[PDB]
Design an enzyme around this catalytic site. Structure first.
Site, PDB file in Angstrom:
ATOM      1  N   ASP A  80       1.154  -6.477  -4.287  1.00  0.00           N
ATOM      2  CA  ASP A  80       0.236  -6.956  -2.772  1.00  0.00           C
ATOM      3  C   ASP A  80       0.739  -7.997  -2.008  1.00  0.00           C
ATOM      4  O   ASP A  80       0.763  -9.141  -2.548  1.00  0.00           O
ATOM      5  CB  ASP A  80      -1.290  -6.966  -3.502  1.00  0.00           C
ATOM      6  CG  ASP A  80      -2.343  -6.819  -1.419  1.00  0.00           C
ATOM      7  OD1 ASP A  80      -2.687  -7.266  -1.013  1.00  0.00           O
ATOM      8  OD2 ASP A  80      -2.730  -6.297  -2.310  1.00  0.00           O
ATOM      9  N   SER A  81       1.202  -7.437  -0.994  1.00  0.00           N
ATOM     10  CA  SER A  81       2.189  -8.640   0.463  1.00  0.00           C
ATOM     11  C   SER A  81       0.650 -10.569   0.212  1.00  0.00           C
ATOM     12  O   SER A  81       1.397 -10.952   0.909  1.00  0.00           O
ATOM     13  CB  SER A  81       2.511  -8.448   1.522  1.00  0.00           C
ATOM     14  OG  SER A  81       1.523  -7.730   2.151  1.00  0.00           O
ATOM     15  N   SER A  82      -0.469  -9.989  -0.722  1.00  0.00           N
ATOM     16  CA  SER A  82      -1.630 -11.050   0.234  1.00  0.00           C
ATOM     17  C   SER A  82      -1.370 -12.132  -1.015  1.00  0.00           C
ATOM     18  O   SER A  82      -1.378 -13.284  -1.036  1.00  0.00           O
ATOM     19  CB  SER A  82      -2.428 -10.544   0.121  1.00  0.00           C
ATOM     20  OG  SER A  82      -3.567 -10.111   0.929  1.00  0.00           O
TER      21      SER A  82
ATOM     22  N   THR B 186       0.308  -1.385   0.227  1.00  0.00           N
ATOM     23  CA  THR B 186       0.029  -0.071  -0.361  1.00  0.00           C
ATOM     24  C   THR B 186       0.601   1.329  -0.100  1.00  0.00           C
ATOM     25  O   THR B 186       0.838   2.447  -0.780  1.00  0.00           O
ATOM     26  CB  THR B 186      -0.848  -0.212   1.111  1.00  0.00           C
ATOM     27  OG1 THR B 186      -2.135  -0.916   0.959  1.00  0.00           O
ATOM     28  CG2 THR B 186      -2.211   1.425   0.935  1.00  0.00           C
TER      29      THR B 186
ATOM     30  N   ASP C  83      -0.470  -6.985   5.004  1.00  0.00           N
ATOM     31  CA  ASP C  83      -1.040  -7.698   4.907  1.00  0.00           C
ATOM     32  C   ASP C  83      -0.169  -9.340   5.711  1.00  0.00           C
ATOM     33  O   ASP C  83      -0.626 -10.487   6.420  1.00  0.00           O
ATOM     34  CB  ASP C  83      -2.176  -8.515   4.041  1.00  0.00           C
ATOM     35  CG  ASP C  83      -2.910  -7.187   3.165  1.00  0.00           C
ATOM     36  OD1 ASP C  83      -3.931  -6.760   4.649  1.00  0.00           O
ATOM     37  OD2 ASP C  83      -3.288  -7.381   2.165  1.00  0.00           O
TER      38      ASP C  83
HETATM   39  N1  LIG Z   1      -1.187  -1.703   4.451  1.00  0.00           N
HETATM   40  C1  LIG Z   1      -1.186  -2.639   2.889  1.00  0.00           C
HETATM   41  O1  LIG Z   1       0.379  -2.435   2.378  1.00  0.00           O
HETATM   42  C2  LIG Z   1      -2.408  -3.555   2.110  1.00  0.00           C
HETATM   43  C3  LIG Z   1      -1.485  -4.361   1.253  1.00  0.00           C
HETATM   44  N2  LIG Z   1      -3.126  -4.749   0.944  1.00  0.00           N
HETATM   45  C4  LIG Z   1      -0.913  -5.129   0.991  1.00  0.00           C
HETATM   46  O2  LIG Z   1      -0.278  -5.910   1.566  1.00  0.00           O
HETATM   47  O3  LIG Z   1      -0.578  -5.494  -0.103  1.00  0.00           O
END
Ligand SMILES: NC(=O)C[C@H](N)C(=O)O
Ligand SMILES: NC(=O)C[C@H](N)C(=O)O
Ligand SMILES: NC(=O)C[C@H](N)C(=O)O
Ligand SMILES: NC(=O)C[C@H](N)C(=O)O
Lengths: 354, 355, 357, 353
Positions: free
Chosen positions: D77-79, D12, D110
């Site tokens: 995205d870290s997910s 993010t 994430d």
């Molecule tokens: N705050 C973040 O970085 C959440 C984002 N969806 C991620 O983990 O890439």
């Protein structure tokens, strides 16, 4: 078997209603005998114990704990306590020092922090636990914090060699000269802002042995009845006038703790600085503590209070600063320069040096 | 577009080193122009804006925020501020009230809580946000809290109608007469012990609208320059002697806040109680606040300070009690009995009444 | 006088040592009789009370509290409890509902949060307090949290009309379907991350009456024994393979709570998304909860799990999501579409619907 | 001068809107150049620095900090991140190890805790700071946490010798294999349920008593040999034996069981039979608590202990999984030995009693 002396000085823990207000209440040992958590009747008869002495039930590990209840008289609301009262408690501990392995002091909450700090200083080279405890609700009221605070204090003093004046409340053991009262109603009434608790009780007992002070078995207990009574605390407030500070610092005052703003700052207006300088000339010693709950006094601003006869209190609580000031000023035949050097040392674990 | 006045009074937020110590530093607008988070140059030229006026970049929703920097002189370390200084700030806000939609006051942290409380009382019937903010580290030092505290204040005043004197620090908006300083080094330096924050900033902005006071549009802004200067604060300590209290309460003192032990208790020794009674006879008014950070003053013990000319401060901060005492004693032509009745009311959201 | 039923199901509060480990221990009423804080002998004889019934000493204000101890058998470590066990407790409360003014349930801590959440759902239109409590240390060990937790529960149920399944521990009363266990050793073992406590006990008792649910006096107590047993919880972890998810979601599973990352996100790899789509086609319902302790599931990323048969759990605890899923799936003759609508409502105060502005 | 490598993997912190949702956004160095807190233009021209390299403004004492931005591609995205992605980051750090004095890794929140833990294990004998950081709000949005998190990370890596994989968020430096994510929206998103290694305020406070010691005699060994066939299984009340059987089928080599309270589970025999069966197949099991704070300990008849079960003590699940991946990936060890290693504190992730 380990034997404790339980010194009941007063406080809400043992109060009763009278004229619609709480006042100190006598007859503690009489009540504690009737409570199985506080007195094991079977074991008492089995060993035919003196009627003055109570026995806690067996605990998970370790030795059995017996204790004697010493009810001071008159009993006091802690708002009425002074250096003289704390000296009397120290002297009780001194007279009985060899006969007991530890001490618990039931005390009112209103000034427990001042009392813990005072006793920390009076009891030089202490080798045994002295645990202060109290309550927000009297033990005779059904729904209270007293039962568990008192038991916790006895078990801590009975089972562990923590050679310190501590405060036990709400499952936590604090270094006594590090506590201050942060809540007037909650059971979590006390906080140790610049130091971890010495111990926490839960499923298991966790003790911060890295912080607990070491028993000095070579050195004997020296009790200081020579505590300077003429010390005061002065909280600065915005626009506090020089004339008022002048009046405050008049003889016979020998020492004062100035609670200053933020990192140890005050007004730089000259008439006020003149009065502090004037008081330094008269021989008064001043300790600078922060009004803030957490953090340290440090130099850094043009408004920092420093100079003639002003010693930085670093991260001390005001209760500790006042007690240390009383202690150091009560020492016989020292130069003012030497008194200041002592104020700048960590004498009982009350101050962290950088 | 909404326009704010940014009043720079001093404090660490804008300090500079000199002789190895921090002192107040001038030239704020000059610095802020060079910072894209504080000034949108593209937009300035596109609208050819007055050189005195800065423009924040666009935010997620809502209107654009412009502001004007008013640099007081001299600038002060907040340890040197007094009632007179806070009156001057109130008067600035009074003079410019109609031209701006809100106000931000850069202030030192050492007495910000006193200043917020004072302004809360001076600014009767306030209809617009006045947000105090400051920093533990100056804005010219690279690693600091100043940037985000100042931006947050401007965005809060710029985007929301919170007709209160507030304090914004470290993503939180506090009711100003409810704050006190709890940490001398951490960025979380302030706490509001007996009330929720009015707002929190994160991904989203959460505002406790059911706490925020209501705009009284019929009533005009009345600024109280008539604040009693002869008020004091006295912290009790164990064994404090009657003789010392006597000296403290001598004329010309008109009012005092007594910071007492626990739920509002003090020594019951007669010589001390006699001095408080003596001072009551001279006409002095006393407010009883707890030294404790959290909780309320309440009766219940034989040691509770109550009686002639003593008003319970309930859950007030000492900063609020002192300011309220200054306010009430400065009101013209009231009986001492009436002054006490006002001290016992919630005049600016600083005190919670029992029920 | 107000009368309570004290239901002792097991848990550390009443355990004993055996072979060097704690196991459930019988004979609670026998112990409590000997304790003056739990039983007022004077008053018992003065009113010649039934031997099964105990009496608390008088409290500061209010009415006197009497209670009856019902010791379930067998007693259980809460790690062994299941939906069936919680149904049995609900049925005990149902049978004795009219005879008592409130209930306290002594329960193990390991699954107290699941049990509180389950009972919250099973006890529809509840009008009286049902207070779960437990301890980290048994009541027969001298230095313990059990004495004060049990007394507190009894006094709360005895003195206040909070028509909710709650959990009382360490001077705090939590809404039961809002709690989760955050510490495995400290006495402050429970936390209510997305809601204030319903009450706090200190010198005085503070109750958040603005949160406590309202008694619906017209509506009768309906106990749901029809709770779907085939529900599960699945915690995602980085790189969790599609093949493993496939195996997890095989029949006869009817519902699952997916604990996802952050604000409700998961891997967007297609083979995994295909297994969730495949399970939706089989009729499985999925609730998306965050692994995080505090905060809410929300859309916003390309990695947000949303779509066919997936309902957002918003700020629900996983314990509440699982119970609500069991409740809704157990309801008779509803379309899958309707089941999903119910999952998205606040049925027992377990979920906060998002604010507009 | 101290030089850092800034590895931008996504998250993010650098995202942009597209189709009404946040997705990874390129062009970080281009933005950072325009920001005076991140790039000192005067100094750049005065030393005629390579265009790829940025310079932080001065502080008073201490050395100046320069850094190079390495933007991975694709950004994630870290997910979506897995062991393979964290191995790639470890290899970047390995290739450039000698050229730089420290590292900062911009990462999605994430799975930051999993990534910090993984890198902690992969980077054996690490001598230099590797600071992970991220944000709840993108740096291009005006009111955000990104600016101060990124600067803080750069200044920590630039100024202090903390030879650890850490996570810096919201003025705190955490030991990476000790963190977990506790809030999905607040800026205080992370908690170390161990003290922080450092705190930033008026002053910087570092817990030097906790920070690990540099082993200058030993070289950096990067473990690409991390076992991929490990899993995490959260127990829930009444979880059936049949479901556990399916979960523990080959080819799974290791599993972290998140159990109840102080490390307990159902004692029903059919379930215990499946764990015993899996132990016979050679599977290793680590027992972690579902609870945020505290330790796994014996004491109850319901405690999960026995053949091939190792207590995780006070480890976070993120650390247990990574340590399991690490230990199982080690070549030619007896199963007994693998269990002994799981029971040691290898990177400061576990406190022994
Ligand atoms: N705050 C973040 O970085 C959440 C984002 N969806 C991620 O983990 O890439
Ligand atoms: N809770 C207490 O003990 C307060 C009491 N007034 C005292 O200090 O004696
Ligand atoms: N942080 C600060 O602003 C402290 C400063 N001495 C002031 O209050 O003006
Ligand atoms: N504290 C406890 O009660 C833990 C116990 N294993 C139980 O849940 O039954």
């Amino acid at each position: 078997e380990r034997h404790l002396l339980l010194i009941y000085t007063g406080g809400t823990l043992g109060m009763q209603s009278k004229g619609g207000v709480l006042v100190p209440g006598p007859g503690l040992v009489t009540l504690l005998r009737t409570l199985p958590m506080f007195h094991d009747k079977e074991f008492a008869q089995a060993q035919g114990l003196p009627d003055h002495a109570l026995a806690l039930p067996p605990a998970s590990h370790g030795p059995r704990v017996l204790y004697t209840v010493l009810e001071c008289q008159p009993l006091l609301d802690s708002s009425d306590m002074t250096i003289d009262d704390w000296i009397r408690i120290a002297k009780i501990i001194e007279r009985h020092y060899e006969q007991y392995q530890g001490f618990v002091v039931i005390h009112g909450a209103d000034t427990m922090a001042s009392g813990a700090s005072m006793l920390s200083f009076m009891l030089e080279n202490l080798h045994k636990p002295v645990i202060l405890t109290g309550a927000q609700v009297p033990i005779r009221v059904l729904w209270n914090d007293a039962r568990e605070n008192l038991l916790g204090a006895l078990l801590v003093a009975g089972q562990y060699i923590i050679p310190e004046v501590c405060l036990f409340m709400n499952s936590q053991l604090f270094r006594g000269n590090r506590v201050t009262k942060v809540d007037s109603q909650k059971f979590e009434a006390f906080c140790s802002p610049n130091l971890s608790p010495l111990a926490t009780v839960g499923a298991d007992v966790t003790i911060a042995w890295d912080l607990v002070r070491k028993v000095k078995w070579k050195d004997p207990l020296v009790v200081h009845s020579n505590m300077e009574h003429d010390v005061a605390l002065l909280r600065l407030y915005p626009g506090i006038p020089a004339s008022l500070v002048r009046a405050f610092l008049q003889p016979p005052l020998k020492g004062v703790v100035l609670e200053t703003f933020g990192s140890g700052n005050g007004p730089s207006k000259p008439d006020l600085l003149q009065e502090l300088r004037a008081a330094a000339q008269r021989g008064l010693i001043m300790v600078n503590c922060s009004q803030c709950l957490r953090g340290s006094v440090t130099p850094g601003y043009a408004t920092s209070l420093a100079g003639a006869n002003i010693v930085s209190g670093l991260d001390m609580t005001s209760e500790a600063a006042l007690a240390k000031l009383s202690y150091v000023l009560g020492l016989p035949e020292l130069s003012l320069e030497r008194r200041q050097e002592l104020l700048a040392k960590d004498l009982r674990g009350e101050m962290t040096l950088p």
